[PDB]
UniProtKB/Swiss-Prot annotation, chains A, B:
Substrate binds at T43, G155, L156, I157, N158. GO terms for biological process: biotin biosynthetic process. Keywords: ATP-binding, Biotin biosynthesis, Cytoplasm, Ligase, Magnesium, Metal-binding, Nucleotide-binding. It is an enzyme of class 6 (ligase). One of its GO terms (cellular component) is cytosol. This is ATP-dependent dethiobiotin synthetase BioD. The lineage of its organism: Bacteria, Pseudomonadati, Campylobacterota, Epsilonproteobacteria, Campylobacterales. The active site is at K39. It comes from the Bacteria. It is found in: Cytoplasm. InterPro entries: DTB_synth_BioD, P-loop_NTPase. It catalyses: (7R,8S)-7,8-diammoniononanoate + CO2 + ATP = (4R,5S)-dethiobiotin + ADP + phosphate + 3 H(+). Its main location: cytoplasm.
């Protein structure tokens, strides 16, 4: 096949998509699985004055494989407003709705030259891109596998299960992974006992990202 | 009919269930709609040393209608662990799984003596109560209407829409209401523009709690 494609979404913004995407791509590249990081849509950015956006971090890592990459090669719709993409676009660029057909072509083109194309979304699954399409719809159009990153705090059970319900209702292969931060041992006492019960009762278990680099690489590469 | 029953859930813990439940019950009582506040299951409490739990706040308000009420009349399963009810029960009371049939009877009994019975859940919809039942399942068994309180911060769009998807997939009447806090005007710039678009495109609109006391009272009392 051409390169595999893995979409990274989350329970919400700030859950750890960027952090976990970078860790996974680093691991894959270290294993000889040539992997690129893409951030097709990004809000809340000012590129004239700040070089620490998700796309900038991705670019730093990606340039270890291709010096010629620039920001515009890996991020295509970028807005100042710290909001959902649809709202940012309507306010800042009302004459250019986000074109997911175009994005699909650009993203799939990278499957020629990489073993794995990692595509970070923005916010969570239901975040609107166009009037018709949210982030999940975009992932579906891409025919990507899904990695959904959860936060590690009280409330993650609800947030994971809401996403599980939405994901299992659609036709895609997915995995939910908890981004367990350094210094959090409340997790193991408070939330983990339910994750373990859930996993004994589910065909698709919720995993801990930091325990799962090998498993998630395998997931990302399996099948067609 | 006997009194109506309204379940109050949320996007997650700390979104405003208790605060909004109290405001709604106060409004209803002021309008002559005799309303009780119940917190059947509560975690994270130590009643020997703290009298500020949701059930204690409810009790204060409820005693304006019935001096004889005590905590045990309005809250039935109470645990120290700051966790989902299922985990707290398994750790603190392994021989007494939460009995939702019993809770249903106790809650419905209040429909004899009140025009409206408001039942606050714990956390969000997918929070586990027993191995088989979550908070939504409990609300379904109760045959209550649902009021789902959302937080007012960046990310509410995703959280509201995840809940909308779950709720619309089940057989219950529901309303999602945003708990818009004092001093937040970012909401109106960041999130509200999408809520307005969504509402023009949806048969069941997302409302702002603080704008909606009359509407939510009407909702709670309508029909059988
Ligand atoms: N495992 C982690 N350990 C420490 N800090 C983390 C971890 N995961 C995320 N962070 C921090 O949390 C913030 C949000 O993470 P980020 O990966 O950007 O999330 P998202 O892409 O979902 O918005 C960042 O400041 C990031 O450095
Ligand atoms: N509209 C509001 N204005 C100010 N403070 C609020 C508001 N809503 C909630 N709070 C505060 O936020 C915290 C969580 O609210 P609470 O109603 O207890 O939520 P939940 O019942 O969902 O856990 C409390 O400290 C509460 O006083
Ligand atoms: N204030 C105590 C609330 C307990 C919240 C439980 C949340 C479980 C979850 O969804 O992870
Ligand atoms: N860091 C900028 C992220 C933008 C997050 C948009 C979240 C929309 C929502 O679900 O309410
Ligand atoms: Mg972010
Ligand atoms: Mg990110
Ligand atoms: Mg609370
Ligand atoms: Mg509460």
């Amino acid at each position: 096949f051409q390169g595999h494609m893995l979409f990274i979404s989350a329970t919400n913004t700030n859950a750890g998509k960027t952090t976990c995407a970078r860790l996974l791509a680093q691991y894959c590249n270290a294993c000889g699985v040539k992997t690129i990081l893409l951030k097709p849509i990004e809000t809340g950015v000012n590129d004239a004055i700040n070089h620490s956006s998700d796309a900038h971090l991705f670019l730093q890592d990606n340039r270890l494989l291709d010096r010629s990459l620039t920001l515009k090669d890996i991020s295509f719709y970028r807005y100042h407003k710290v909001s959902a993409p649809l709202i940012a676009q309507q306010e800042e660029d009302p004459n250019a709705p986000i074109d997911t057909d175009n994005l699909t072509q650009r993203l799939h083109n990278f499957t020629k030259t990489y073993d794995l194309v990692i595509v970070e979304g923005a916010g969570g699954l239901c975040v609107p891109i166009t009037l018709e399409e949210n982030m999940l719809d975009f992932a579906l159009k891409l025919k990507a596998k899904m990695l959904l990153i959860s936060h590690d705090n009280l409330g993650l059970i609800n947030d994971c299960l809401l996403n599980d319900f939405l994901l299992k209702s659609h036709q895609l292969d997915y995995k939910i992974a908890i981004n367990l931060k350094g210094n959090n041992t409340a997790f193991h006492s408070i939330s983990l006992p339910y994750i373990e019960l859930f996993n004994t009762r589910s065909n698709n278990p919720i995993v801990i990202f930091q325990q799962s680099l090998k498993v998630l690489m395998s997931f990302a590469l399996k099948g067609s």
